[PDB]
Design a protein around this ligand. Structure first.
Ligand SMILES: [Zn+2]
Ligand SMILES: [Zn+2]
Ligand SMILES: [Zn+2]
Lengths: 46, 66, 452, 51, 302
C-alpha cells in the first residue's frame, strides 16, 4: 500500500493503476493467507 | 452439484422415415434473415471476447521505467 | 502460376461481364475454388445469411498474425467484384455479390441449375484405354509438332494459327519451318494443368469474333472442369457457340467424341486436370563429362531433349546423349536461356543424384557449419559450362539508334543529353567525346526536339 | 513396474488450477516476471507460469 | 492451399433426439440437423477439389460409417433411391445419396430392434473410430500433405447427464488428436449449456466448442464457426466461449474437485480422505501416518 500511494503521489494516478494491476495477484494471495490465519485464530480462540 | 415411451419412440422414428422419403428439400436450411442476425451477433460477440483475450497472450514489455 | 493466371484473367474481365458470368452455378463453383482459403472461408460464411455484413466483423475474425493474408483476401475479393462495399451509417458495409451468392447456394443445396453441370446419358466407354488414350494422342501430337520432331500426323490449322499468333512458337516463312521461342520451351517446364491453362487463356485472348461469346466459352470451360471422366454428356444443353468450341476442344484433346456431329461427348482426363493437379519417366543423370542418361521411353521427353542434348544412342530405358557445345548453341539460338535448361536438368535429376548431393552436403556441413550451401544436385562444372556458353553467345549486345556529335558548343550537347536522359531513352552520354546515344524508339523525340 | 514389497501407497495432496485470463501482464509467483496468462493456485491464489 | 479430411461424428441417438423434440416445440429435428450437415459437407467439398469427407453415426447399439459405404456393401450393390434430386452436382450428389441411404438403413435398424434399450452411449467409440479413419487416410497418403479435422455433432436434450465412463476414452481421443494435429470441433444441440468433457476436447485439441439450442439456422453456425479449415487455423480466432477449468470429478462423491487427494497407484481423484484408509477404485491400503499428516490442522497461537 505504501508503494501504491508513493506511485500515486509520484505519477498522479494515470499510471498507478498499472502498478496496482502488476502486484494485484501477490496482494490478493497474501490477503488470502492473512484471512486464513485470522479465521483459524478466531476458531482456536473460541 | 422425463423418459420417453417406446410408442412415441416408434412414432418419431416413423415420422423421420416419412420425412426422409417424401422430400429432403436441402433449400430449407436457409435462415429467415432474422435468426441469422441473432446467430451472427452471438458468434461475433464470442469472437470479440476471445480476440480481446487472445490479442496479447523472455518477459513482456512493461510501460514502467526500469 | 496457375491460380494467379486465371485470377488475373478474371480480373481483366469487366464488372458487367463478371455479373453475367455468375449466372451459372458451375462457373461460380469453379471460380470459388480459385480464391485464397481465407477468401473461401469468408465467402462461405457470408453466403447463408441474407443480411449485409460489416467489414469490421471480418477483421475481428482474423488473428493478428494473419492480417496480411486478410488484406490479400479482401483485395482479391474486391477486385474480382465478389463484394459490393456499401457506405451507410458511417460503416464500411460489405455485401456479397447477389448473383454469385444465389448461384453458389443453388449449387450447394441443389435446385435450379439450368444444367450447368450437364446431363448424363449413361452410355459410357472406357476411360483409361480410350479417353485417356485419345487425350494423350492429341496432346502428344500437338506437343510433338511444337517441339519440332518430324510427324506423319500434324495437328489441325486452328491450333497452328493459335500457336503462330501466340507470344510463343514463332515461325519464319523464308526458311519455311516452325520454331520454338523462349516461351516455347518455358511451356514445357510446368506440368500439363497450367500448360492447358496457358493455351486456354491464349484462346480466350483470341476469341474476339462476333461468333464467339466470352461468357459462354468461360461457362463451358468451367463446366468441363466440373464434369467427371468416363461418362457421356448430351450436347443439347449447350449453345451453338459452345457446340463449335466443343468441336475445337475435341480438336485440342480436352474432350473425346465418337463421331463428329454426335449428340454425346466424353470428357477426358485433361478436363479434370484443368481444375487442379491430381523412378519417374524422364529422370536423367548428368556426369562431369557432359554425358546424359535420361530414363525415358516416351517420345516427347526424348524430343524435348533433342533441343539441347546431342543424342547418340537410344535404348528402351534411356537415350544416351551428350551435352555438347553445338547442342546448347542450338538451344540458345532458339531463345532458350541457360536458366531454363538448368531448371529442366534439375527438375528431372535422378534420385541417385539427389542422394549423392545430400551426402556431399552432409559431409560439408559437419566440416564447416559456419556457412550454409545450397543443394547442388547436378555437378557445378556442367552448370558453369552452360552459363559460359550462354555468355559466349552474348559476347556483344546490339542497340540501334542515333549518336549526335560535332557540337561546337558544350551547352547544346549537354541540353540534348539531359533531355534524352529525362525521356529515358539514352544509353550513353559523355562530355569528353561530345557524343550521346539514344534508342531507335527514342530517336523520334530527340529529332523533333532538335528540329523544333 | 513397482515391486510388491513397496508399501508407499500414499495419497498425494494436489490442486487443479483454473487457467486465468487477463490482458494485463502480472507478476508470476514462480519466476517474478510479467506474464499475460497463468494459472491461479486453487489453495493460495498465486499464479504460475507452466504446468 | 492443402486439402483436409472432414470426419463428422454425428450422434443420432433416437432417445436423445426424441427428448430434444419433446423439449422443443418442433418435431423431427433429426431431419433438420441432417440436412444442415449435408449442406455443410457440400460446402466443405466445395472448399477444395481434393478434400474428403467421413461420416460416422453413433447410434444406440454401436457405430456405423455412413460415407463411404462398406466395401462389402459396395461389392454387393445399386437401388438408387430418390431422396436427393438428381440435377445437382454429381460430386455432391454421390455423397448426399450415400449419406441419406445409410441414414435410412441405420434408422430401419433402429426401428427393427427399438425394444432393446442400452444405457451405454457410443459417442467416444465413434470418436475413436473417426480418429482411426483419419490415421488410415493420412498414412495411406494417396493425397500428399492431407490435413484433417474432426467435427462432433452431439445432442444433450436435458435428459442424459454427464457420463463418467466416457472420461478416459475422451481423454485418449484428445491425446491422439493432439499427437496427430487434428482439431476436434464439437457442436452440442441441447438444453444443458455445458458439456465439460467435450469442452476440454475442444480446448485441448485446438478445436471449437459451440453449444446451440435450436436446430433451425444450424447451417449458419456450421459455415461460420465450424468452417475453420486446418490450413487457416492459426490465422482465424475461435469463437469457443465458456472456457473450461480442466478439472475433474471426485470418485466417491462426484463433485468437481478443488485441492484434493489422488491415489499414488491408480490416480483416482478423491475430494476427501476415503473411509477405511483404503483406495476406493484401487483397493490399496493407505498408510495411517501419511493421511494423519494430511488430516493435520494448520497451526496458530492462542
Ligand atoms: Zn513464472
Ligand atoms: Zn499455492
Ligand atoms: Zn488407487
Amino acid at each position: 500500500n505504501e508503494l501504491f500511494q508513493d506511485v500515486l503521489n509520484g505519477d498522479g494516478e494515470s499510471m498507478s493503476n498499472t502498478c496496482t494491476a502488476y502486484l494485484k495477484p501477490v496482494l490478493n494471495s497474501i490477503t488470502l493467507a492473512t484471512h486464513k490465519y485470522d479465521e483459524y485464530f478466531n476458531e482456536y480462540n473460541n | 452439484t422425463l423418459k420417453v415411451s417406446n410408442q412415441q419412440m416408434l412414432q418419431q422414428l416413423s415420422l423421420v422415415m416419412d420425412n426422409l422419403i417424401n422430400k429432403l428439400d436441402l433449400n430449407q436450411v436457409v435462415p429467415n434473415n432474422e435468426v441469422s442476425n441473432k446467430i451472427n451477433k452471438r458468434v461475433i460477440t464470442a469472437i470479440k471476447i476471445n480476440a480481446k483475450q487472445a490479442k496479447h497472450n523472455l518477459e513482456v514489455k512493461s510501460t514502467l521505467p526500469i | 502460376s496457375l491460380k494467379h493466371s486465371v485470377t488475373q484473367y478474371l480480373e481483366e474481365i469487366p464488372q458487367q461481364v463478371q455479373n453475367r458470368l455468375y449466372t451459372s452455378p458451375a462457373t461460380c463453383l469453379a471460380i470459388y475454388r480459385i480464391l485464397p482459403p481465407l477468401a473461401k472461408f469468408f465467402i462461405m460464411a457470408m453466403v447463408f445469411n441474407e443480411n449485409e455484413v460489416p467489414l469490421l466483423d471480418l477483421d475481428k475474425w482474423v488473428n493478428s498474425n494473419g492480417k496480411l493474408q486478410f488484406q490479400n483476401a479482401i483485395k482479391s475479393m474486391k477486385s474480382l467484384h465478389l463484394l459490393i462495399p456499401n457506405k451507410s451509417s458511417g460503416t464500411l458495409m460489405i455485401n456479397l455479390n447477389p448473383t454469385f451468392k444465389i448461384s453458389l447456394r443453388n449449387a450447394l443445396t441443389g435446385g435450379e441449375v439450368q444444367n450447368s453441370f450437364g446431363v448424363v446419358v449413361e452410355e459410357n466407354v472406357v476411360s483409361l484405354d480410350l479417353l485417356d488414350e485419345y487425350s494423350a494422342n492429341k496432346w502428344e501430337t500437338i506437343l510433338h509438332f511444337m517441339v519440332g520432331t518430324p510427324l506423319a500426323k500434324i495437328p489441325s490449322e486452328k491450333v497452328l494459327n493459335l500457336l503462330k499468333h501466340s507470344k510463343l512458337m514463332e515461325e519464319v516463312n523464308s526458311t519455311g519451318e516452325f520454331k520454338i521461342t523462349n516461351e516455347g520451351f518455358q511451356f514445357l517446364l510446368q506440368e500439363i494443368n497450367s500448360q492447358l491453362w496457358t493455351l486456354l487463356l491464349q484462346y480466350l485472348k483470341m476469341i474476339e469474333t462476333s461468333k464467339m461469346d466470352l461468357v459462354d466459352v468461360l461457362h463451358f470451360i468451367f463446366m468441363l472442369g466440373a464434369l467427371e471422366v468416363g461418362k457421356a454428356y448430351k450436347i443439347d444443353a449447350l449453345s451453338e457457340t459452345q457446340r463449335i468450341m466443343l468441336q475445337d476442344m475435341r480438336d485440342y484433346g480436352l474432350v473425346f467424341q465418337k463421331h463428329s456431329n454426335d449428340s454425346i461427348f466424353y470428357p477426358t482426363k485433361l478436363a479434370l486436370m484443368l481444375t487442379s493437379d491430381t523412378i519417374p519417366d524422364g529422370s536423367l543423370i548428368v556426369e562431369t563429362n557432359f554425358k546424359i542418361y535420361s530414363y525415358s521411353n516416351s517420345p516427347l521427353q526424348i524430343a524435348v531433349l533433342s533441343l539441347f542434348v546431342h543424342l547418340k544412342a537410344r535404348f528402351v530405358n534411356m537415350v544416351l546423349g551428350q551435352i555438347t557445345r553445338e547442342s546448347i548453341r542450338r538451344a540458345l539460338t532458339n531463345g532458350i536461356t541457360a536458366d531454363q535448361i538448368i531448371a529442366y536438368l534439375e527438375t528431372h535429376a535422378h534420385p541417385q543424384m539427389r542422394r549423392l548431393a545430400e551426402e556431399k552436403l552432409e559431409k560439408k556441413l559437419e566440416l564447416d557449419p559456419n556457412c550454409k550451401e545450397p543443394l547442388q544436385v547436378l555437378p557445378p562444372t556442367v552448370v558453369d559450362q552452360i552459363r559460359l556458353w550462354q555468355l559466349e553467345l552474348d559476347r556483344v549486345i546490339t542497340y540501334e539508334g542515333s549518336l549526335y556529335s560535332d557540337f561546337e558548343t558544350s551547352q547544346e550537347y549537354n541540353l540534348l543529353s539531359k533531355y534524352a536522359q529525362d525521356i529515358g531513352v539514352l544509353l550513353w552520354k559523355d562530355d569528353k567525346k561530345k557524343k550521346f546515344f539514344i534508342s531507335k524508339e527514342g530517336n523520334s523525340q530527340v529529332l523533333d526536339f532538335a528540329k523544333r | 513396474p513397482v515391486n510388491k514389497i513397496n508399501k508407499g501407497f500414499t495419497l498425494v495432496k494436489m490442486g487443479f488450477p483454473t487457467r486465468i485470463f487477463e490482458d494485463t501482464p502480472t507478476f508470476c509467483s514462480c519466476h517474478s516476471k510479467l506474464v499475460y496468462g497463468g494459472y491461479f493456485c486453487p489453495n493460495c491464489h498465486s499464479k504460475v507460469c507452466s504446468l | 492451399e492443402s486439402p483436409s479430411l472432414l470426419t463428422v461424428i454425428i450422434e443420432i441417438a433416437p432417445k436423445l433426439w426424441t427428448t430434444f423434440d419433446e423439449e422443443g416445440n418442433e418435431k423431427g429435428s433429426i431431419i433438420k440437423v441432417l440436412e444442415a450437415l449435408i449442406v455443410f459437407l457440400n460446402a466443405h467439398l466445395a472448399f477444395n477439389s481434393a478434400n474428403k469427407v467421413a461420416v460416422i453415426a453413433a447410434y444406440s447399439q454401436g457405430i456405423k460409417y455412413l460415407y463411404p459405404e462398406s466395401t462389402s456393401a459396395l461389392k454387393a450393390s445399386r437401388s438408387d433411391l430418390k431422396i436427393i434430386n438428381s440435377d445437382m452436382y454429381r460430386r455432391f450428389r454421390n455423397v448426399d445419396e450415400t449419406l441419406v441411404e445409410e441414414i435410412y438403413k441405420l434408422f430401419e435398424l433402429e426401428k427393427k430392434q427399438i425394444e432393446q434399450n442400452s444405457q451405454r452411449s457410443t459417442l467416444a467409440g465413434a470418436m475413436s473410430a473417426g480418429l482411426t479413419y483419419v490415421n488410415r487416410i493420412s498414412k495411406e497418403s494417396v493425397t500428399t500433405s492431407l490435413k484433417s479435422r474432426l467435427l462432433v455433432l452431439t445432442c444433450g436434450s436435458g435428459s442424459s447427464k454427464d457420463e463418467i465412463f466416457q472420461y478416459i476414452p475422451i481423454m485418449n481421443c484428445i491425446f491422439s488428436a493432439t499427437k496427430m494435429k487434428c482439431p476436434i470441433d464439437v457442436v452440442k444441440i441441447g438444453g444443458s449449456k455445458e458439456s465439460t468433457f467435450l469442452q476440454q476436447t475442444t480446448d485441448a485439441t485446438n478445436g471449437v466448442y459451440l453449444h446451440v439450442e435450436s436446430t433451425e439456422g444450424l447451417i449458419q453456425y456450421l459455415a461460420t464457426a465450424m468452417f475453420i479449415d486446418p490450413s487457416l487455423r492459426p490465422i482465424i480466432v475461435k469463437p469457443n466461449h465458456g472456457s473450461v477449468d480442466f478439472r475433474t470429478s471426485c470418485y466417491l462423491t462426484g463433485r468437481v474437485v478443488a485441492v484434493g487427494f489422488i491415489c499414488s497407484v491408480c490416480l483416482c481423484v478423491l475430494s476427501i480422505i476415503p473411509p477405511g484408509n483404503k483406495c476406493p477404485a484401487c483397493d490399496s491400503q493407505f498408510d495411517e501416518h501419511v493421511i494423519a499428516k494430511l488430516k493435520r490442522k494448520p497451526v496458530v497461537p492462542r
